[PDB]
Ligand SMILES: Nc1nc2c(ncn2[C@@H]2O[C@H](COP(=O)(O)OP(=O)(O)O)[C@@H](O)[C@H]2O)c(=O)[nH]1
Ligand SMILES: Nc1nc2c(ncn2[C@@H]2O[C@H](COP(=O)(O)OP(=O)(O)O)[C@@H](O)[C@H]2O)c(=O)[nH]1
């Protein structure tokens with residue numbers, strides 16, 4: 001478990017914040033939010049929790065993500081979690097967090113596969129995290145089931161648009177490997193909000209459920225459908241694994257063996273896996289934080305220039321200074337005589 | 349393929365399933381959530397009452413270990429008037445292996 005690529009980026013945020021906080025101003029470290037987009041049963045929830053590094057989300061077959069979950073990571077001296085609707089309560093075990101998520105979902109949506117556009121806000125504190133916003137959205141569908149109205153498609157789409165048309169947001173498009181990539185819904189959305197692929201990152205899931213004799217080699221090599229940032233293959237847990245409480249360590253080891261042994265993927269074994277997706281995202285934050293430094297320097301540079309002309313004199317102040325008093329006297333008298341002539345004569 | 353490939357293919361479907369004296373076979377794999385099928389959405393829009401539509405489930409040997417399609421084959425998840433029929437075809441390895449029908 002855990003995400004150790006944050007450690008190299010936490011102090012940079014602290015140092016810059018301490019730099020501005022001393023002057024009574026805050027640092028515009030507007031780190032982007034990460035939205036996970038995909039279709040029903042694509043694997044989005046499994047992907048997202050691997051970036052957080054904690055096992056707390058609900059996952060499995062069926063419509064499990066019935067409400068948008070917004071996770072806010074906050075740097076803190078101790079690790080704990082809390083909800084907005086459980087004010088005054090403290091969560092010290094993520095299993096309780098997962099159960100609360102299901103309970104809060106059913107209380108509003110019912111049990112017959114309902115949805116609700118009102119999100120759930122989870123705030124996890126920890127010393128090993130940045131101040132990040134992570135969004136876990138419901139998957140998209142075509143036809144209603146259970147109590148879903150005829151317009152279930154568009155209600156889900158609007159929930160999606162509110163979080164992906166927002167600037168400064170990484171779109172993490174997850175698609176299954178055992179379905180034709182031309183018929184993925186994630187990529188249809190990405191190419192409508194991010195035409196040039198500057199934000200979009202593709203993930204290919206379910207590489208271990210391919211039909212025998214077929215592979216995704218022309219996908220992971222960015223040949224079938226060119227994507228600016230390429231595709232990353234991942235092998236998450238199976239539904240049996242979820243119900244079997246399979247450990248994370250075993251899942252990662254199996255993912256490593258898979259890519260190292262599959263004949264069509266060995267030459268890409270180092271571009272794929274859970275840890276590589278962490279590295280790409282972390283590197284994506286680091287590029288953003290370092291791309292904003294020029295603005296911060298210019299702000300401080302402008303302020304010094306404005307203040308410098310006066311503090312040059314204040315720093316040399318001595319109360320016993322006849323020269324200052326007489327210089328002040330000549331300035332006041334010259335100001336009065338100019339103001340006086342202005343009002344009477346019209347000069348100036 | 350131009351940007352409007354989606355609506356060019358759809359306009360071809362709407363020339364054969366938008367008329368009477370026609371049966372429609374809604375084909376969809378079983379290794380994906382049935383709620384996301386494009387076959388049913390088209391059939392439901394053209395044949396709301398399910399008079400003509402018949403559902404087919406094509407890939408039952410490719411389902412993730414630990415689940416099954418009973419909720420569909422028993423016409424419970426998305427009840428369809430004429431039910432659903434499950435089939436198991438030749439894999440890609442078999443097509444290239446010259447396996448007899
Ligand atoms: N074996 C395997 N199972 C997967 C993979 N990706 C997703 N699944 C399964 O697909 C189901 C759906 O997972 P989930 O992410 O909750 O779908 P979601 O509704 O999009 O969140 C789960 O049972 C996962 O175990 C994969 O790469 N390999
Ligand atoms: N293993 C397996 N493969 C299947 C099954 N049904 C279809 N396929 C595969 O589906 C692939 C494409 O089928 P096809 O009918 O051409 O899809 P189409 O583009 O709609 O015609 C073929 O390679 C088949 O081997 C199945 O039940 N099991």
Ligand SMILES: [Mg+2]
Nearest residue numbers: 044045064065
């Ligand atoms: Mg989900």
